[PDB]
Amino acid sequence: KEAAFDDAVEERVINEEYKIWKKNTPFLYDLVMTHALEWPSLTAQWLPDVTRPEGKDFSIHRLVLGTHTSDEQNHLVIASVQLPNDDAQFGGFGSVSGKIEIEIKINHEGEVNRARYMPQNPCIIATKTPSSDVLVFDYTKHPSKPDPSGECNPDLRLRGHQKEGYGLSWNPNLSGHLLSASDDHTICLWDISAVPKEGKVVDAKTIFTGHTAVVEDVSWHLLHESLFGSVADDQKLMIWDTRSNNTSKPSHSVDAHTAEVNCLSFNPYSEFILATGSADKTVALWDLRNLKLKLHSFESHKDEIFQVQWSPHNETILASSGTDRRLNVWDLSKIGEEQSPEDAEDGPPELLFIHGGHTAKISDFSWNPNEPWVICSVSEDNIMQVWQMAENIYN
Amino acid sequence: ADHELFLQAFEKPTQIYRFLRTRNLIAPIFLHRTLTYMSHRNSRTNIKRKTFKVDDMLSKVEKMKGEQESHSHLQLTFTGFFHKVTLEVLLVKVCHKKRKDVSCPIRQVPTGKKQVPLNPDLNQTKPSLAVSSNEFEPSNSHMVKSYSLLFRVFVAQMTVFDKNRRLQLLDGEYEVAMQEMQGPTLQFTLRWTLRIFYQFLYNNNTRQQTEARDDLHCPWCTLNCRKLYSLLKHLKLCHSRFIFNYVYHPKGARIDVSINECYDGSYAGNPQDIHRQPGFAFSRNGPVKRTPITHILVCRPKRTKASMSEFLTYSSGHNRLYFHSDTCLPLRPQEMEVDSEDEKDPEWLREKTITQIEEFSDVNEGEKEVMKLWNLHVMKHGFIADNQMNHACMLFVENYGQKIIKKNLCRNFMLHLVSMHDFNLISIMSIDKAVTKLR
Amino acid sequence: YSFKCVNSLKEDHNQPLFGVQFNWHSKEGDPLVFATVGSNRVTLYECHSQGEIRLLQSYVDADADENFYTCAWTYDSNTSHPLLAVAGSRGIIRIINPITMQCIKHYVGHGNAINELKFHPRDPNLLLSVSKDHALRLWNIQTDTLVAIFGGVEGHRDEVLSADYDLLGEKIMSCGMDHSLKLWRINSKRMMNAIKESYDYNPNKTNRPFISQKIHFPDFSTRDIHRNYVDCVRWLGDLILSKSCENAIVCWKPGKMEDDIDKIKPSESNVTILGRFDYSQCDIWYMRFSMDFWQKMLALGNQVGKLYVWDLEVEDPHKAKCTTLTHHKCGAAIRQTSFSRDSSILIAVCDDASIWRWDRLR
Ligand SMILES: [Mg+2]
């Protein structure tokens, strides 16, 4: 056929391009960290805690990683990283032996479809599985040395879903309040703030169904404990203010993009600014006051978009990931700024930066606390990269 | 000197960047205006606050201005066809492609047809009117991409709107042609009801020299560098498969280029795929496990300044492909586990020693069998210390009990025990003890 | 018993060729097809009547420099497509499908140039590869696994040259520069257990690498026959044929005339010679002879461009035969001969990238 020949060609081209980008990096970033895992991951979460040992030049951070192996035993993992915390220090930068190390392994039944730590307790995390339920765990209650037998204490799994999903969000203000979203076209809500009789069985307190398509994502409010929206392939965003008691008719519902919506995120520093992400290769945004206005559109991704995340430490900085093996960085201030024809042929102004590391569909990324401008990225090629852009770009 | 050598060699690197030129021009790898030495680009600064709770009001008013107007049916007659039969007119509706959809969806719905004359002419008329309702709907502003108009008898097509929902069709008498599968045509009305030089070295066996036209634009990627500095940088980094040198001819610039010598460009992936039997390599369709590695490249930059005078990264883990010691085949990441393909007993040795024993003529089978049965067990454990020999003969019969019995050869075993005591390694306190444990 | 030059061709690169192989897997009636490999190219032709030969296909390797050495025609049990594999100095083995005009399999496990490839007469997934690494390997071209490695403490010491299956496919002979000729067996229980195993292995199934078989001992050998190199051997029913640079081909049997072939003790230390064959000007090595699928005639190339032909019939090797078919164009050398499934045509390669053709008139 043709597609085979064509793909061989495309592969060789991508290889060349990565060669070039690597040769060119030194003038581009303030940090380059690459590390290969045995099995890839599908998760990313920076632990909100940081320790910095004295007499040295580096910090220490802990990361929350998942695992989707081929066939063998699945695991939940959290490992260690030694970020340089210094400006004058530079074997490589610090010790010679190692800068990354695994520390936490837990047996897991099925792959990991999602994993987030609870905001109130980082020792509490959730887990989406190939099954139709939810698992919760507290690592401090299990040894890092994994059970050579296999499956172990599910640590209060949940119930109320019928197909798998990917949505996951604790309520920031209210403990125990956690939302879910699966192929069931439904949103299931447990409240584990108080389950003395665990029994590994808790059913979702409330189950919402307003989308008639497979739901894609859900996120709580950032200030309100009784507010959150919804995302399905319906290309319909529905506003779900709880305490109104209707799992059928939400508070609001409009069409966001012409293609199915995938990812969704709210600005922390503001009250109203929403960040939306869809399959439309588009990026839109909205406000809680009025909604019948697609505020703006970022139009440079060349395939679907699967993740959006605002910046901590920065009010006007956002991030767009997808499948194009690229990663974008925008700017809300430079909206329509007259630029030179060469600045324009470079690109539109408001687009701020584009990451050029990975060579596969960028699975997932994350900001972190404890550090101003750094993000880790995970692809499907067993690849983990951490970087810091050069400084000169801003200011 | 078959100059095709000079040709064929420098032929290769060219087309590559050539393709890459176009690709990057549409497939940006990184915004150049971010680059350090391309600092003249990105004329704008990063000086702004731009609170957000006001960004809405600026749009809240702008949308009042942005709403210019809208259009509020149609009717049109077809003047007879002209050529040097009934007609067919359609209303095709196009929607947006979706996730599972590979191509855009199109819906060809007919509003109707009529009976046009058989290629009529002028001065013969004394007439089929086409009237349209609002088939298009405002709800379609989320699902349909566009609407067009089709005409057949023999094909013709027109579209109704613009991407801005802007109608493209005013009212009036229009003359149009059409194609089948000057000439045939139809009329109708409408109604809404420093010179720079180069030198190409070939190991001094020959060369070629040229001159840059429209200089300070990349001779490959047409990148507009405004300085010899930035241009030299972009060249010695991006189009790296060559090598360069700065000559500074008095006329403003001269660069004698040469081919790179090593340019270590080889696949950088799972180093194993290189040898997968073809068709499976680059499968890219299933997770695969491999050994862990970690590199560091950018740790702490210098951030110096420009200096034309100047113009004239470690590992952690296994970074290669290991092989089997005896067959020179690849080594799966799992096979490289505790299996160490080495121990004290090589098969071929056991064979060789027995055979060599059988060369001897002046021996009885009641002796050769014994010697072999023993020497093999000797090899099997590697006994060295003399304090072991007692335990040795013990374990020996402890294993070969059934056999020597089945061999009925214990009597020569005892003769051997004799010999060994004679060589001062057995005490009498065990020789018997053997025959005891034997039964 | 009369062939005539009805055609002769020549390449353009002018670099000597070595290989000639009719496809002896022709469903009865299908046209005659044969191939030939040169410096770094392969060639596909078809025999036509009136001394006509038609170019069909040709491939080439550019990415390195190699001097291809051998070829062999086989098929696919799955869909019956013709199959050709070749190998050169680089020591790699490739497998090409003309139906798709692509290579589907490549094998790299040797350490030097390869010298010959043959298949088991019965099984079509068993490829024997002889190299200069003193090691004769043997692959399952279907499950992509090695099987045996003949050579070691008692192997050949210098650059194995040529080998040949027995007529039935359970016994092999080998010959190399060290004047040495050794016998291997395949019928042993261990061996066939190994083979059956080979036909069963899933890499995804186990964390284990397949386990080959190492053999460190010939069944029998000697170096008493020639006092020079030996570079081509042929099973003869249960008799042997071999040539040297001593300008004579010899036939013999191991042990004594009474000694059966399948009772031979490994420590056998005697051989029985029967007769000799004679020719002129074969004063260089690496020159081969072939025989008809019906084992009735003998062909042999020559240094000065001549030919020499015998009959494998009751013709007593004392005065068996003498037949020299000659032409006046090239006398550079002739490497290799080849017959069809029948005895219709006979091709041979001259040293100057020129082909020849001889059509028989019985
Ligand atoms: Mg391949």
Coordinates of N, CA and C in Angstrom, one line a residue, chain C residues 110 112-116 128-137 150-151 155-164 173-178 180 182 184 230-231 285-286 288:
Chain C
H110 N 26.4 -13.5 11.5 CA 27.7 -14.1 11.2 C 28.8 -13.1 11.6
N112 N 31.7 -12.9 9.0 CA 32.4 -12.6 7.8 C 31.5 -12.9 6.6
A113 N 32.2 -12.9 5.5 CA 31.4 -13.2 4.2 C 30.8 -14.5 4.3
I114 N 29.7 -14.7 3.5 CA 29.0 -15.9 3.4 C 29.4 -16.6 2.1
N115 N 29.3 -17.9 1.9 CA 29.8 -18.5 0.7 C 28.8 -19.4 0.0
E116 N 27.6 -19.7 0.6 CA 26.7 -20.6 -0.1 C 25.4 -20.7 0.7
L128 N 20.4 -23.3 5.3 CA 21.8 -23.5 5.8 C 22.6 -22.4 5.2
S129 N 23.5 -21.8 6.0 CA 24.3 -20.7 5.6 C 25.8 -21.1 6.0
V130 N 26.7 -21.1 5.1 CA 28.1 -21.4 5.3 C 28.8 -20.1 5.2
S131 N 29.7 -19.9 6.2 CA 30.5 -18.7 6.2 C 32.0 -18.9 6.3
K132 N 32.7 -17.8 6.5 CA 34.1 -17.8 6.7 C 34.4 -17.8 8.2
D133 N 33.4 -17.6 9.0 CA 33.5 -17.7 10.4 C 33.8 -19.1 11.0
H134 N 34.0 -20.0 10.1 CA 34.3 -21.4 10.5 C 33.0 -22.1 11.1
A135 N 31.9 -21.3 11.0 CA 30.7 -21.8 11.7 C 29.6 -21.9 10.6
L136 N 29.0 -23.1 10.6 CA 27.9 -23.3 9.6 C 26.6 -23.3 10.4
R137 N 25.8 -22.2 10.1 CA 24.6 -21.9 10.9 C 23.4 -22.5 10.1
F150 N 27.2 -25.5 13.9 CA 28.2 -26.5 13.8 C 29.6 -25.9 13.7
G151 N 30.4 -26.2 14.7 CA 31.8 -25.7 14.8 C 32.2 -25.4 16.2
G155 N 35.9 -28.4 14.9 CA 35.2 -27.8 13.7 C 36.2 -27.6 12.7
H156 N 35.9 -26.7 11.7 CA 36.9 -26.3 10.7 C 37.7 -25.1 11.2
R157 N 39.0 -25.2 10.9 CA 39.9 -24.2 11.5 C 40.1 -23.0 10.5
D158 N 39.6 -23.1 9.3 CA 39.9 -22.0 8.4 C 38.9 -21.9 7.3
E159 N 37.9 -21.0 7.4 CA 37.1 -20.5 6.3 C 36.5 -21.6 5.5
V160 N 35.4 -22.2 6.1 CA 34.6 -23.2 5.4 C 34.1 -22.6 4.1
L161 N 34.1 -23.5 3.1 CA 33.8 -23.0 1.7 C 32.5 -23.5 1.1
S162 N 32.2 -24.8 1.2 CA 31.1 -25.4 0.5 C 30.5 -26.5 1.2
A163 N 29.2 -26.8 1.0 CA 28.5 -27.8 1.7 C 27.4 -28.3 0.7
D164 N 26.8 -29.4 1.1 CA 25.8 -30.1 0.2 C 24.9 -31.0 1.0
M173 N 27.8 -32.7 4.1 CA 29.3 -32.7 4.0 C 29.7 -31.2 4.0
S174 N 31.0 -31.0 4.4 CA 31.5 -29.6 4.4 C 33.0 -29.6 4.0
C175 N 33.4 -28.6 3.4 CA 34.8 -28.5 2.9 C 35.2 -27.0 2.9
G176 N 36.5 -26.9 3.3 CA 37.1 -25.6 3.5 C 38.6 -25.6 3.2
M177 N 39.2 -24.4 3.3 CA 40.6 -24.3 2.9 C 41.6 -25.2 3.6
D178 N 41.2 -25.8 4.8 CA 42.1 -26.5 5.6 C 42.2 -28.0 5.2
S180 N 40.1 -30.1 4.8 CA 39.4 -30.9 5.7 C 38.0 -31.0 5.3
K182 N 34.3 -32.9 6.7 CA 33.8 -33.5 7.9 C 32.3 -33.8 7.7
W184 N 28.4 -34.2 9.1 CA 27.4 -33.9 10.1 C 26.1 -34.7 9.9
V230 N 39.8 -27.4 -1.0 CA 38.6 -28.1 -1.4 C 37.4 -27.2 -1.3
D231 N 36.7 -27.0 -2.5 CA 35.8 -25.9 -2.5 C 34.4 -26.3 -3.2
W285 N 41.0 -21.3 -7.4 CA 39.9 -21.9 -6.6 C 38.6 -21.0 -6.7
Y286 N 37.6 -21.5 -6.0 CA 36.2 -20.9 -6.1 C 35.6 -21.1 -7.5
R288 N 32.8 -23.9 -9.4 CA 31.8 -25.0 -9.0 C 31.4 -25.8 -10.2

